[PDB]
Each structure stands twice: as C-alpha cells, then as structure tokens.
C-alpha cells in the first residue's frame, strides 16, 4: 500500500505478500521519479526493503507501491568485457542494453559453481613470495590481508597492475595455455583509487579484456553488496560458457562488511558481537560460493579478494570471519613498507594447505614445498632472534641466531623487493630462494628430504 515507516537506511512498507522473495519492486513517488528496490525480507502483510538510489524523497501517506513481477537478475553475455559499467546502473559508457543473452541469478542457486578436484593449473600473480610460499592455482580461494595505516590501495593497485601480464609468464611455464579474462568489481572505493586502478589496467594493456564495475561510497549498501554477486555471476557465466580462465578481484570487503552492518536494522534480525551480524558467514559464503573450478573439466573462476584489517590484527570480525571460509591468507607487513619494499608481504603469518595439490608435473618442481618450509623456518628463526637480540644484546647470541639474522636481512631485501610490471617465474623464484637458503651448511638444513635436497644442493 504505502510506506508504513522508515528506520535508518531501510524503509518498512505495508503491502501484500504477492511478491516473491528478492523480487524487484518499484516505489512510485509524487516528485515525478520512480525508484527501484529489492525485497530484503517478507512478513505477514509487511515488507522491509531498501531503495537502490537515494534514501530521502518518499512520502508517508501519499506514496504508491507497485510490483515488477520479476526477480533480481542481471543479463550476462560475451560482450561485457571492454566496456565500462556501474553496479547500480549509472551509464557513462553503457547504452540502453547490457548485451545479455541469458538470464542468471545473482546467488548461484541453480548453477552451484565449485571444483570437485584439486587444482592442477598453476597461476602466478608476479610475486616470488606469494607464488613460491603460497602456491596458488586455478580455483583457489585465498584473500589478501591488509592493515589500517599502511598503503593498502597501493598494494591493491600493484596487484591489479600485475593482473594481465601473468598470462605471458604463465604460458612459458605451461600452466596456462588458454584465454584470460579479468573481472573488476569496486564497492566503496574512491574515484582516484578507481581511476588509478583503471589506469594500471589501461597501461598494462588489459582494458579490452577486463570489465569494470564502479560503486560509490555514498550509495546504498544493497547495491555495493549486490554488485559482487553480479560481477561473480558475469565472470562465472563468461568463464563457464567458453571454458576460459576468469580472475575476479573484489575490493573492498570492508565496505561490504560495513554495509552489511547497516542492513538488518529494521528487520526481525539483529546484529551480533562487535556490530557485525551473526549471519555474515552466510553472506560471505554467498559471494565465495561462486568460486572454484567450473563444470566441464576446462577453465575455472579464481577469486582473490582484497581485505584490510581495521585494527591491524586477525582478531576482528571482518578478517576473522572471512579467513574462516578460506584456507589461509597472505599477511602484509607495514614494517617492511616503512623501511621500503614493494610488496611488503610477510611469510611468517602465511600458510596454505593446498601447496602440495597445486604443484604438479611439468609446470613446477618438487623442492618448492621444502624450500618454502625452510625459508619460513629461517625467516621465523631470524624474526624470533631479532626480537630477542634487542633485549639481551649481541653478547648472548650464537652463530645460529646470526645466520638467521643475516638470512632475514638478505632474503628481506631480495625476495620482497620486486617491480610492479615484471612477473617473476616460479623457477627463478625457487632459484633465488635456493641462493638465499644456500648461506647455511647442508647439515643445518632439515626442512627437506635428503634425496631431493642432495640433488638440488
């Protein structure tokens, strides 16, 4: 009927239960403009929905409501790459149609995209510590960890600048010999950071093969949280339809987690501990549910989200809740960025349980897992001896602590220092890790087998 009330950003309207769950509705205002909204929850002759554009402008007793009769679905096609689009529908380079040949849901109910096997195709992003220490492949879910106070937008601009040149380095390794596509989804990002991220992809030469989804910070949280489902549905539809490799970068997860806290403030549900709701694991599981290898045994859709720690730790609900759905993450240190390093990713708080399944034959080696454990043990020994060396001094430290301290300084300024346009190979990263690991004796190395360590010594 009319708008019954409004509590925060969401409005509570009294209508009939003829509309389905998540069905699109059109609110008719008396100002001469119609607005679209999504039904967040249904009730007993009551409905709680949020407006897609704006929050003010509706009436109280003179408002009019109407049902569209169609659920929320974005038309996906094969011509979405190259053009510039928006999350809510702001056309700046788009026309009347989006070139959508099929109708797919934004939740992945009838699709169910997920891999039923371990990833064999190795994918590299141009980082020696990320590719060598993590060993990520196609269909893996590993998010990037950030911090509050450090340049997370510069690390996301460097990771976005590295996306596009990984195909020529991966083609020589024999890990990727197919088409490559990039799915860019932005929500709650600045215009200068989105212009620099689009300028990095335009300078790299991946503007025609990449799609851009722009979402503003002053818009509603339903459009910013709804844009990654449409971008993941377009990347899953393009990657599943042609058997191509699609890489999806979702930035930022803190804007979606902060936008999810504003929602549910006028419904029956309530928030949980620390301001975030207790059902946020299903909301992050809905976006992460469309990640993995596609059905067909050809191609896959990889997901690499960018999350920033608001408290500089993993005890928060945003990195702790998102880290539980994944199987590890990469920790970026601000201490390495303060002294000067690009990227300042550390190897102490980083571990992946899919490094053995990702490494195969013909595109990787067998000593990379032992060299990563030996480099993580030497970096943990040097980082552990570096904190104890400040308190007591250099009078009670042995040669083993000085070897790990020299290995941490030698490997800290060599492996962590790299360019933003050059992509290092996995064999050059393992050969550079063997030179940094070749500072100690052969008897002092026990994180590898003796047969493989004696051959590659």
Q: Does 453 sit near another protein (CB under 8 A)? A: no
**Site for another protein, residues 174 to 203, rule: CB under 8 A:** 188, 190-193, 195-196, 199
Cα–Cα distance between 388 and 248 in angstroms, integer? 42
Is 139 near another protein (CB under 8 A)?
yes
Stretch that binds another protein, among 79-87, 165-173, 177-185, 269-277 (CB under 8 A): 269-277
Which of 204, 255, 300, 302 contacts another protein by CB under 8 A? 255
Distance CA(147)–CA(196), nearest Å, equals: 20
- Assess 361 for contact with another protein (CB under 8 A): no
Q: How far is the CB of 168 from another protein (least distance, A)?
A: 27
Type and span of the H or E element at 184? strand 180-186
Q: Which of 98, 100, 115, 439 binds another protein (CB under 8 A)?
A: 115
Residues touching another protein: how many (CB under 8 A)? 152
* Binding flags for another protein, 401-440, as an x/- string (CB under 8 A): ----------------------------------------
Q: Site residues for another protein, window 29-58 (CB under 8 A)?
A: 40-44, 48, 55-58
The helix or strand, by DSSP H or E, that contains position 223, with its residue range, turns out to be helix 221-242
Instruction: Give the span between the Cα atoms of 270 and 222, in whole angstroms.
Output: 17
Would you say the C-alpha torsion 456, 406, 341, 384 has a positive or negative sign? Answer: positive
Asked if 150 interacts with another protein (CB under 8 A), we say yes
Distance from C-alpha of 110 to C-alpha of 124, rounded to nearest angstrom: 31
Contact between 21 and another protein by CB under 8 A: the answer reads yes
- N residues, the chain: 457
Q: Which of 389, 414, 434, 439 binds another protein (CB under 8 A)?
A: 389
End-to-end CA distance of the chain: 78
| Residue 269 neighbours by CB distance under 10 Å | 15
Query: In the set 100, 118, 410, 453, which binds another protein (CB under 8 A)?
Result: 118
Answer yes or no whether residue 4 interacts with another protein by CB under 8 A.
yes
Burial class (CB in 10 A: 0-12, 13-18, 19+), 164: buried
356 is an interface residue for another protein by CB under 8 A = yes
**Residue 80 or 260 with smaller CB distance to another protein:** 260
Q: Of 335, 406, 422, 457, which lies in the binding site for another protein, with binding defined by CB under 8 A?
A: 335
Stretch that binds another protein, among 3-11, 78-86, 169-177, 433-441 (CB under 8 A): 3-11
Q: Which long-range contacts (CB under 8 A, 24 or more apart) does 102-106 make?
A: 102/75, 102/76, 102/77, 102/237, 103/73, 103/75, 104/73, 104/74, 104/76, 104/233, 104/237, 105/71, 105/72, 105/73, 105/233, 106/72, 106/73, 106/74, 106/226, 106/229, 106/230, 106/233
146/234 with CB nearer another protein: 146
CB of 128 to another protein, least distance (A): 17
């Amino acid at each position: 009927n009319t708008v019954s009330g409004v509590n925060g950003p969401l409005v509570i309207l009294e209508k009939v239960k003829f509309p389905r769950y998540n069905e699109i509705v059109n609110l008719t205002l008396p100002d001469g403009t119609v607005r679209q909204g999504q039904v967040l929850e249904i009730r007993g002759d009551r409905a709680i929905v949020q407006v897609f554009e704006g929050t003010s402008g509706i009436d109280v007793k003179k408002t009019t409501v109407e049902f569209t009769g169609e659920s929320l679905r974005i038309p996906v096609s094969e011509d979405m790459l190259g053009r510039i689009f928006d999350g809510s529908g702001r056309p700046i380079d788009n026309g009347p149609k989006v070139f959508a040949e099929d109708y797919l849901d934004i939740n992945g109910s009838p699709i169910n995209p997920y891999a039923r096997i371990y990833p064999e195709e190795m994918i590299s992003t141009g980082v020696s510590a990320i590719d060598t220490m993590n060993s990520i492949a196609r269909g893996q879910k590993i998010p990037i960890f950030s911090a509050s106070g450090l340049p997370h937008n510069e690390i996301a601009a460097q990771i976005c600048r590295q996306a596009g040149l990984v195909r020529p380095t991966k083609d020589v390794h024999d890990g990727h010999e197919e088409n490559f596509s990039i799915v860019f989804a932005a929500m709650g990002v600045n215009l200068e950071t989105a212009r620099f991220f689009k300028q990095d992809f335009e300078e790299n030469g991946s503007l025609e093969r990449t799609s851009l989804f722009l979402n503003l910070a002053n818009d509603p949280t339903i459009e910013r949280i709804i844009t990654p489902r449409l971008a993941l549905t377009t990347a899953e539809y393009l990657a599943y339809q042609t058997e191509r490799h699609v890489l999806t970068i979702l930035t930022d997860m803190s804007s979606y987690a902060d936008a999810l806290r504003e929602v549910s403030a006028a419904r029956e549900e309530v928030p949980g501990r620390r301001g975030y709701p207790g059902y946020m694991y299903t909301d992050l599981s809905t976006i992460y549910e469309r990640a993995g290898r596609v059905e067909g045994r050809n191609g896959s859709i990889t997901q690499i989200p960018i999350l920033t720690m608001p408290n500089d730790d993993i005890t928060h609900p945003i990195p702790d809740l998102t880290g539980y759905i994944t199987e590890g993450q990469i920790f970026v240190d601000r201490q390495l960025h303060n002294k000067g390093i690009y990227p300042p990713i550390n190897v102490l708080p980083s571990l992946s349980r899919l490094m053995k399944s990702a490494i195969g034959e013909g595109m990787t080696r067998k000593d990379h897992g032992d060299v990563s454990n030996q480099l993580y043990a030497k970096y943990a020994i040097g980082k552990d001896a570096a904190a104890m060396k400040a308190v007591v001094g250099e009078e009670a430290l042995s040669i083993e602590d000085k070897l790990s301290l020299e290995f941490l300084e030698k490997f800290e300024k060599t492996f962590i220092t790299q360019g933003a346009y050059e992509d290092r190979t996995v064999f050059e990263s393992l050969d550079q890790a063997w030179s940094l690991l070749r500072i100690y004796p052969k008897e002092m190395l026990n994180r590898i087998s003796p047969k493989i360590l004696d051959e590659f010594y």
